[PDB]
Structures are given as C-alpha cells and as structure tokens.
Amino acid sequence: EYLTKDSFSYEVYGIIAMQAAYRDYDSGDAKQDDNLGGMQLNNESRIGFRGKKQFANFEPTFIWQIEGGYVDPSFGGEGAGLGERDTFVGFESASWGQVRLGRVLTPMYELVDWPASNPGLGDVYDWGGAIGGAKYQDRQSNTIRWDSPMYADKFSIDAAVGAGDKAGLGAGDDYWGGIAAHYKLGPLQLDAAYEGNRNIEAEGQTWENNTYLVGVQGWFENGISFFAQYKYMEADASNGVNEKQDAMSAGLMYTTGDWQYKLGYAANFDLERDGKTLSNTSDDVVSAQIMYFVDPSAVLYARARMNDFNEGLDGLDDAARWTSGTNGDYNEYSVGVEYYF
Amino acid sequence: EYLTKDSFSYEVYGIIAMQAAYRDYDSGDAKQDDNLGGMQLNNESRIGFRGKKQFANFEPTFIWQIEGGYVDPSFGGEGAGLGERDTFVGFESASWGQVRLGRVLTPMYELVDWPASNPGLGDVYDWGGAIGGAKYQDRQSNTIRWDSPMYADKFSIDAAVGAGDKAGLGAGDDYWGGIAAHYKLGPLQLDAAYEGNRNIEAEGQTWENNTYLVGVQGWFENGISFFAQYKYMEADASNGVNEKQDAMSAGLMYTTGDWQYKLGYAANFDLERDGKTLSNTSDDVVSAQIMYFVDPSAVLYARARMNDFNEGLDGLDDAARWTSGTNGDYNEYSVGVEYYF
Amino acid sequence: EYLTKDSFSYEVYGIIAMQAAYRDYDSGDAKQDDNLGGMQLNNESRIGFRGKKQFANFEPTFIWQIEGGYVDPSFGGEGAGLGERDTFVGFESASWGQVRLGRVLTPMYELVDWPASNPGLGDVYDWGGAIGGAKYQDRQSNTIRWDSPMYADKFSIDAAVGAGDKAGLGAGDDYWGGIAAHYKLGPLQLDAAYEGNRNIEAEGQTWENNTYLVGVQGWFENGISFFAQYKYMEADASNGVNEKQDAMSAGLMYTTGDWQYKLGYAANFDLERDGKTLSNTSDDVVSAQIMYFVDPSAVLYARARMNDFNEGLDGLDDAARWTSGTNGDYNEYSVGVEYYF
Numbered sequence A, B, C: 001e002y003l004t005k006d007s008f009s010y011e012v013y014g015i016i017a018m019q020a021a022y023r024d025y026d027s028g029d030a031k032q033d034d035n036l037g038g039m040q041l042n043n044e045s046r047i048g049f050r051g052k053k054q055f056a057n058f059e060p061t062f063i064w065q066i067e068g069g070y071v072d073p074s075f076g077g078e079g080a081g082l083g084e085r086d087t088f089v090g091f092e093s094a095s096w097g098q099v100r101l102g103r104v105l106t107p108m109y110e111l112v113d114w115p116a117s118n119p120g121l122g123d124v125y126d127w128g129g130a131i132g133g134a135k136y137q138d139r140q141s142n143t144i145r146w147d148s149p150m151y152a153d154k155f156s157i158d159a160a161v162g163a164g165d166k167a168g169l170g171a172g173d174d175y176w177g178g179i180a181a182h183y184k185l186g187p188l189q190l191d192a193a194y195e196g197n198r199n200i201e202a203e204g205q206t207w208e209n210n211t212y213l214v215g216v217q218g219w220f221e222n223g224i225s226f227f228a229q230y231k232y233m234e235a236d237a238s239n240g241v242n243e244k245q246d247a248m249s250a251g252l253m254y255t256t257g258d259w260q261y262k263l264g265y266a267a268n269f270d271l272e273r274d275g276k277t278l279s280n281t282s283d284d285v286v287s288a289q290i291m292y293f294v295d296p297s298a299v300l301y302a303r304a305r306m307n308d309f310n311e312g313l314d315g316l317d318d319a320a321r322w323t324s325g326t327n328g329d330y331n332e333y334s335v336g337v338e339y340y341f
C-alpha cells in the first residue's frame, strides 16, 4: 500500500535552464542586425524519463531513456517532443560497461561539446567551421555506442557507428564511425578522438570526412582548472577536391568558495582547398563567465562573448557555403540559471 | 525507503478537457460550409510538470513550470509538445510576490480571456477584431512578468514586458509592455489593463498599438454573479494612418446548488480609419451555457452560441485583412467535460 | 505524509521498443535501393499518462489517457508529442462496458493490426492494398467508440463512428462508422468486422468504401496457436466506377518454454475495376520470427520477411495511385526488444 523507490519502473528527471541573452550583431546590414539582435530568452529546460530492468532470463541489465527537447530556445518556437535529446535502449554489465542503441552523442562530439564548447564557444568550435561534407555528427539517431568501463581506474573508450542524416529518412546511404579514448593521469585527463563520415552528399558531390582531436583537461588543488584541444578536419570530394581545416579551443577556470571564474577562447584557422589557403575563412571567439554555485543542484551565471567569423566562401557547386558566420559577427551578454533534478 | 511528497522534485498536473462541438456555418459558399461545419471533438487536455526549490544560497524560492499543449484540438492534428502552454522559471518571496521569465499570459490577455471570453465569446472578444498591427499578444514567449502580492487584501498588479513574434525567431524587433491592476470592493472586483505593442510589421507598415481595458466582476450571496468589460484599441502605422476600434463583453450567471446558468455577449464595434467609420466591420456573439458541478474536481456543460461577424475589410496594402470573420458566420452546439488534477 | 497508490491521480506507463532493421530493396533503380535500404534503428518507444476518477455526482467512472507517439521510428525524425497515440476521455460501468471519445483504433483496424499484421505483415495487410478511397481508418481522432462487456464470458462488440481526415481539419465532410464482434469458444475466438467510409475525396472523385472482415484465432494447450483472416474491400466513386479487392492473412505459432516460433503470410489479390481484373496488382509477404520471453515484462526477437508488391496502377485521375509497393519490393532482417511497464 505504501510506496518505495522500487514501486516505480521509471524516473522523471529534468534540467531547468533559462538564459536571458542580448545579442549585438554587426553583419553589414542594419535591418538584419535589428532582426537577429536584441534580447531573447533561451529556455533550454527539458524533461526526461529513464529506467532499468533486470530481465529474469538475461544477466546484462536493461537500460532505457527518453529525453525531451529544449522547451523554448531562443530563435525557435515553443514546444518540444519526447525523444529529441538522448533517447535509447541498452544493456550494461560491470566487466564490459554499456552498449546503447538509439539517439546518443558521437564520441567525437561529446568531447567537442564538453569541455570545449563551454562557455558559448560553440558557434566557432561546435558547429562552426568551413569544411565541406560532414566534419562529424553531433547527437545522432540510428547509432550503436559502446562505453567501456574505467579500466584500472584510469582508461576508458567510447566507440560508435551509425547511419547518417539522409540514411535515417531512407534518402541516402551516409554513415559514420567514431572512437574516443580518455586517460586519467594525476590531476590530468588526456583525450583523443576520431570520426569518419562516408557517403555524404553535398554540393553535387559525395564526400568522405576524417576528423581527429587531441585534448587535455586539468584540475589542481589551488582552484585552477583548464582544458585545451586541437582539432584537425579533412574532407575529400568525389570530384577529387581535398579540403583541410584545423581548430583549437581552450579554457581557464578559477574556483574559490561558491564562485567559478572562466575565460574561453576558440578558433578555426583558414581553410585550405587543394593545397591553397582560402583567405579570411577563419573564425574566433573569446568568452568570459562568472558562475555562482547557488545550490548543490543549481548555478547562476553571467557571461560575455565576442564572435568574429569568417568572411564567406563558396562550396564546390559555386554557391555560398553556409557557415556559422553567414549571419554575421556578434557579441552577446547573458545571465542564466540551470537547476538539475 | 518509503516515499513522501518531499521525495519528489516535481509534480505532474493535468487538465483533462473534451468538448464535442457541432458547427453550422453560413459563409455564402455551401462547400466551405460543409468543410468548416459538422461535428468535431475538441480535446484540450494537457499535461504539465512544475516544482519549486529553495536554493541554499538565495532567499527567494525558485519556481518552474513546463506545460504541454492541447493534445488534439478541433481543426488541428494530434499531438502536443511540452512547453507549448505556460512554461517558465522564476522566483518568489512573500513581500514582493513573484517574477517569471519565459512563456506566460500578458496582463491584458489574462483579463480578456478570463472572465471575458467565456463561454465561447473568444472568436469576437479574444482574437476577433479588425484593427491593424497587434492589438495585444496572448500567451507569449520571451516575457518577463511580475505578479505583485495582494496589497492590504485588496489591490494587486500584474506587469510584463516581452519580445514580439518576429523577434522570438530573430526575424524582427517587435516588442511589447503591459500592466493590469485589480481592486476588491465589497462583492466587486474592478479591473484595468493596458498593452502597448511596438515595431509590429504588417501590411507593408510598422505599427504601434495601444489597447486599454476597464472591467468589473461581481459575486453576490443570492447566487447571481456577472462581469462586464470595455476595451479600446488604437493603432498607428508608419505611413501616418490611424485606426481605432472598441469592444465590450458581458456575462450573467446564476448558481444554485450544483448548477450554473450563464449568458454571455460580446461585440466589436465598427472600425474607424483616419476618422472615417468602415461600415459593417462590427462583430458580435451571444452564448448560453448550463454547467453541472459533477465533482469538486470537474464540470460537465452544454453550450449554444451564435457568431455574427463583420463583412470584411482591406488592410493598408489593398488586400483583404484577415479576421475571425473571414471564414463566415456560424452557430455552435456543444457539450463537454473538464477535470483537474 | 507517506504516499500510496491513491495519492496520485495519474499513472505513467510505457512501452520501450527498439528494432534494428536491415532492408534490402529491389526497386529497379540502384540508387533508390541504396537510399531506402540499409540498417536503421526503429525506436517505437512511447510514454503515456492515464487515470480514472469517480465523480461525486455521476455513477459511471470517468477515464482518460494521453499516449505519446513513437519517439524515433525508422524513416522518420526524432521526437513525438503527447497525444499522438490513443488519447481519449470516457466513462465506464460494469453493465454496459465503456465509451471513449477522442483518438482510438477503429473496430476494423484493431483486428487488422492484431493478430493479422504481426509479424511484419503490415506493408501488405495493414496499409497495403490498391483500392481507391479509404478502405478503413486506423487510429483516428474525432471518434466515439463503445466497447461492450464480455457478455456471458463469450461475446463482445466494439462499435464506433467518427470524422474523417479532412473533416478533422475543417477541410471536408468525410466520416466513417464501424463495428466488430468477437465470440470465444473453448480454444477459439471468431471475429467479424465492418467499416464504411463516406464522403472521401480522392483522385477528383468522392468515394464510399465498405470493408468486411472475418477471422479466427486459436490457442491450444500443446503450444500451437494460429490466426487466419479474410478481408473484402469494395469502393464506389461518384463517377460510377466500382472497385473490389480482397486479401487474407494467416499465422502459425509454436510456443515451448520461453520461446515462440512464428510464421506469417498475407496477400492482397488482384484488384478489379468495373468488373475487369487489373493484372499484377497483387501483393504478398512471408515472415518468420523467433521470440524469447526474456522476462514477464519483455521479449527479444529475431525476424526475417520478404515483401513482393504489385507492379503499379493508375487511379481515376490518370496518375499513379500510391501504394505500399510504390517504393519497390524488399526483404528485411531484424532483431528487437520490447518492454512494458
């Protein structure tokens, strides 16, 4: 009659996240600046459901999750479906970790996002860049992913393969595979990742992409922590064209009592096409943040960033190639709250 | 091991609402009448999540809500996302009330909707009317809203500002601000509200709208209750054109035991443009309802209403201006159930 | 302070369902085969909410349900709204069963789907077929449905009427009615169903459809179970054209310990238009499945099927009529898990 935790086969969880963000654009077109700029609220709150089940006739524990999307993000309309964020089934066992099937982060993307896209470095380092094809997927459906245990309390591997965006609609045969490794060494973690995308259709060509990443994260007892990554992107099109672009991201943090101060920088360097540098195809971003640990479950923050994007390039079909710079340079001031339950 | 209310950081709530509604149109086109008319089910059921948190390092209590949309309304397809209805974060404290950020009702809209759009008066008084620009927003994202306490057990204020519809997509610089006040005087409540909309783009112009509302609600011990409102809408276009339209809504109720009888009437008067009345631009609606208090948590009702809309007008771009009358006059017979948990 | 089942006015339930499915198409176009074929994940997981309420002033118990859609099906994008699957309100009482209003299965469709579209027979027997108009609705909004009690522990009836697809958007006056009966005797159940669709607009005509179904299901104590159905579809267009097509579906199962072996076959026979057979308008499918009862709440399965579809036909507007064969023949190998809570 009285309920326990074991009375339920699911749990509801959530991340309640609201950011008030003011953007100031300098696109070269005053009307476009007025349109894209100004104050918005960016409600990234989401609700999820998850659970486990020990099946009577199978030793590896069954796991599942269904996570909703952002309920009212800036630059978007209201409402999100269930299953827009990480949404999967899987199995887990102590000696081999876990396997998930469904919609998850790629091993490469997980590292690109965290630590290296925070705070607000994502327009440059996450989905920014100028290279053709698909540098990497991000959160991707039709994926199988293995997460190894922490071998010897030090070393872990994340590996995955999946269908591409067109393949997921029965509209292509794109696919990808990726792997990441992590090694804990005193106050450091060393990171490495790879992703290969294949049969990518864009700009009248079929592309193969190969992306490589190396990184470090460090946490010291005096309150200083940091990260740094280098990311190398290569792409080859079916007409013989080769492209290369690299990038970096770094962050420095100082944590004292209930406060964290943070500086971030990321850059994409000029793209190279068939051995020739395309001028002014670089991007960078600098960001500063103060965060207050308002509760063990929540943070408040204030953030200021400046994005300086590339000046444009054409793709292999002689039309403009869309990038995160297409809408123009901008600065952003924001405040926010994130609460977890 | 055993759970209490305090074991959870959220609560699920819902409004289960189903209306069977038969419409009889007289548009002037028999096929359009057949299409728009007939029986539908209007399933306005919705599920929401809400909660609070006392952050360790901040006195004002944190609040949040994420409310789903109508799951299967008439004239619409099935399915609603989380966050389509009131969806926000905020803080509250006894001495100053509450502040919410996100998607909420405007102070004006809240009064227009309740009491004054019920029962079925909304096609005229809520989103009906012929004025250009944006008379007011309704439920709006990118909003900050303050709700005062009840000062001296008599007086309260609701105030808000927010981004407009285009601004929320990075496609404009529209915005609005509004305020409402409520004063309790014996068996009466006096209401007043304002909303100003700015930088509204429509019909080739930029518009400013100013809307004003005054109202009364009464509840007497003999079972009679009522409301009445007057609403004045003004609009000025960037080409110099001025428009004005006013409106009213009233309702009379008699409650005895488990029954409420209700009569409603609302009208929009003829629109004026640059000092000249546009003939046959008025609308009105009469509605009758019987409601049964089937449970402390639920009602059953039967409702009959007749809408007589305007005969059309052009906007400032020499094309027809859409109104709630564009689809034609209709009557509607309905029955329904609403249950709250 | 401590919670019981009665502390809540709702319950969350779910079906967690994941299928890894590899398709091999032979459409006649190698690129289309590459696009439609390959491996996808078909995540048919969904979350629902349901509950009941005994209203103080009405004897029949109030019931309601809001069921989410498939969170990430194959050939589709991520995310589902609440209310995409069976979503209704209703009342129930011991002596007369239950009545539901909202979005439910039609009586015909319920039998077509279960038992007769399993395993993977649906491309042929569910939404397959070549007949014009609307052979039947499936899961349909704007419906009222009665489910009788099990009279004398043997006999039950399902009856429903509803608005059509266009009517639900205010874009037509289509509607339907249907009924099914079930009779249980010893190890058998006998099934019969009917659906009539009216005012269906397609191919420049208005159509009336009448579909009839008879079936048997058997379950024996030695572990053998089976089903078989015959389905007869007739359609008449407003220009005088008559069409007829019939179909069947059958399955054989052997259950021993924690295993079920299953073979399925379904076929649509050649369509007849105005008394003339249209050659090569048939379809069939053969399917084999092994299922493991991995837990009382879950199954694992492996499945192989071969679809051989019709070679095409024109509708009454001299353009190709879309069928489940339009994309071409294919075979599919799959494995999956389904878990209920």
Ligand SMILES: CC(=O)N[C@@H]1[C@@H](O)[C@H](O[C@@H]2O[C@H](CO)[C@@H](O[C@@H]3O[C@H](CO)[C@@H](O[C@@H]4O[C@H](CO)[C@@H](O[C@@H]5O[C@H](CO)[C@@H](O[C@@H]6O[C@H](CO)[C@@H](O)[C@H](O)[C@H]6NC(C)=O)[C@H](O)[C@H]5NC(C)=O)[C@H](O)[C@H]4NC(C)=O)[C@H](O)[C@H]3NC(C)=O)[C@H](O)[C@H]2NC(C)=O)[C@@H](CO)O[C@H]1O
Residues within 6 Å of the ligand: A042, A075, A113, A114, A118, A119, A122, A126, A127, A138, A139, A299, A301, A327, A336, A338, B169, B170
């Ligand atoms: C181990 C760990 O995680 N520890 C804790 C840590 O998590 C905690 O901090 C929090 O971490 C999480 C996880 O890292 C952070 O979550 C991230 O938050 C960012 C945003 O803040 C998310 O960024 C989004 O990424 C998606 C991709 O997944 C972006 O997609 C792009 O969206 C843009 C919109 O601007 C699109 O632009 C438009 O595109 C079209 C055409 O394509 C064009 O026509 C339009 O004009 C154009 N632009 C317009 C209209 O302006 C763009 O197309 C699209 N990209 C495409 C198609 O390729 C999305 O926009 C990003 N969001 C933005 C921007 O706001 C990020 O995904 C998310 N990560 C994950 C994994 O979900 C979280 O931010 C962080 N919180 C804080 C406060 O820092 C901390 C506690 O703080 O504790 C650690 O221990």
Ligand SMILES: CC(=O)N[C@@H]1[C@@H](O)[C@H](O[C@@H]2O[C@H](CO)[C@@H](O[C@@H]3O[C@H](CO)[C@@H](O[C@@H]4O[C@H](CO)[C@@H](O[C@@H]5O[C@H](CO)[C@@H](O[C@@H]6O[C@H](CO)[C@@H](O)[C@H](O)[C@H]6NC(C)=O)[C@H](O)[C@H]5NC(C)=O)[C@H](O)[C@H]4NC(C)=O)[C@H](O)[C@H]3NC(C)=O)[C@H](O)[C@H]2NC(C)=O)[C@@H](CO)O[C@H]1O
Residues within 6 Å of the ligand: B075, B113, B114, B118, B119, B122, B123, B126, B127, B138, B299, B301, B322, B327, B338, C169, C170
């Ligand atoms: C303090 C308190 O609250 N006390 C209790 C009280 O709550 C209880 O009574 C209940 O109260 C609630 C709150 O007042 C009531 O909830 C309201 O219910 C109505 C409908 O029942 C909701 O009305 C909707 O409002 C929105 C926003 O304004 C409408 O949006 C418009 O929708 C129409 C659809 O027809 C659109 O038309 C189409 O438009 C396009 C072009 O734009 C055109 O091409 C199409 O042809 C056209 N039409 C077609 C296809 O038919 C229109 O575009 C759009 N808006 C625009 C353009 O701006 C929406 O349609 C309305 N829906 C209706 C009507 O069905 C209202 O929003 C909602 N309020 C809130 C706040 O959410 C509730 O009804 C009430 N219940 C009962 C039983 O009376 C009472 C009793 O329980 O107790 C008190 O104590």
Ligand SMILES: CC(=O)N[C@@H]1[C@@H](O)[C@H](O[C@@H]2O[C@H](CO)[C@@H](O[C@@H]3O[C@H](CO)[C@@H](O[C@@H]4O[C@H](CO)[C@@H](O[C@@H]5O[C@H](CO)[C@@H](O[C@@H]6O[C@H](CO)[C@@H](O)[C@H](O)[C@H]6NC(C)=O)[C@H](O)[C@H]5NC(C)=O)[C@H](O)[C@H]4NC(C)=O)[C@H](O)[C@H]3NC(C)=O)[C@H](O)[C@H]2NC(C)=O)[C@@H](CO)O[C@H]1O
Residues within 6 Å of the ligand: A170, C075, C113, C114, C118, C119, C122, C126, C127, C138, C299, C301, C322, C327, C338
């Ligand atoms: C009593 C009882 O239930 N007992 C237990 C039993 O339930 C348990 O087993 C499980 O049973 C359930 C219930 O029977 C099974 O659930 C069913 O599963 C199937 C799918 O596996 C569902 O099928 C869907 O049906 C809908 C409606 O008919 C389909 O809609 C169609 O989708 C196609 C897909 O492409 C559309 O095609 C596209 O259309 C456009 C335009 O026309 C075209 O341009 C595109 O090219 C085209 N194709 C593309 C892009 O590829 C099509 O248009 C549309 N419909 C129409 C009318 O047009 C939907 O697609 C089907 N799903 C597909 C395909 O995957 C079925 O609805 C569902 N039933 C219910 C009621 O929801 C479940 O499968 C079963 N599990 C197992 C493991 O077998 C068992 C234990 O497991 O125990 C019993 O006791």
Ligand SMILES: CCCCCCCCOCCOCCOCCOCCO
Residues within 6 Å of the ligand: B228, B248, B250, B267, B269, B270
């Ligand atoms: C508190 C008492 C409220 C009394 C409300 C009386 C409202 C009178 O009815 C107004 C409805 O008008 C019907 C049509 O008349 C059109 C004339 O247009 C000009 C309006 O003055």
Ligand SMILES: CCCCCCCCOCCOCCOCCOCCO
Residues within 6 Å of the ligand: C187, C219, C220, C221, C222, C224, C226
């Ligand atoms: C449509 C053809 C399928 C018919 C197959 C029926 C096989 C059933 O075999 C019956 C023999 O039963 C032997 C054991 O009987 C156990 C008691 O069963 C009670 C009723 O199921």
Ligand code: NA
Residues within 6 Å of the ligand: A033, A034, A035, A036, A037, A038, A039, B167, B170, B171, B172, B173, B174
């Ligand atoms: Na703007």
Ligand code: NA
Residues within 6 Å of the ligand: A041, A072, A073, A074, A075, A076, A077, A078, B141, B142, B168
């Ligand atoms: Na938004």
Ligand code: NA
Residues within 6 Å of the ligand: A137, A138, A139, A140, A165
């Ligand atoms: Na992708």
Ligand code: NA
Residues within 6 Å of the ligand: B033, B034, B035, B036, B037, B038, B039, C167, C170, C171, C172, C173
């Ligand atoms: Na109709």
Ligand code: NA
Residues within 6 Å of the ligand: B041, B072, B073, B074, B075, B076, B077, B078, C141, C142, C168
């Ligand atoms: Na609907």
Ligand code: NA
Residues within 6 Å of the ligand: B137, B138, B139, B140, B165
């Ligand atoms: Na609006």
Ligand code: NA
Residues within 6 Å of the ligand: A167, A170, A171, A172, A173, A174, C033, C034, C035, C036, C037, C038
């Ligand atoms: Na494919």
Ligand code: NA
Residues within 6 Å of the ligand: A141, A142, A168, C041, C072, C073, C074, C075, C076, C077, C078
């Ligand atoms: Na999918």
Ligand code: NA
Residues within 6 Å of the ligand: C137, C138, C139, C140, C165
């Ligand atoms: Na349908």
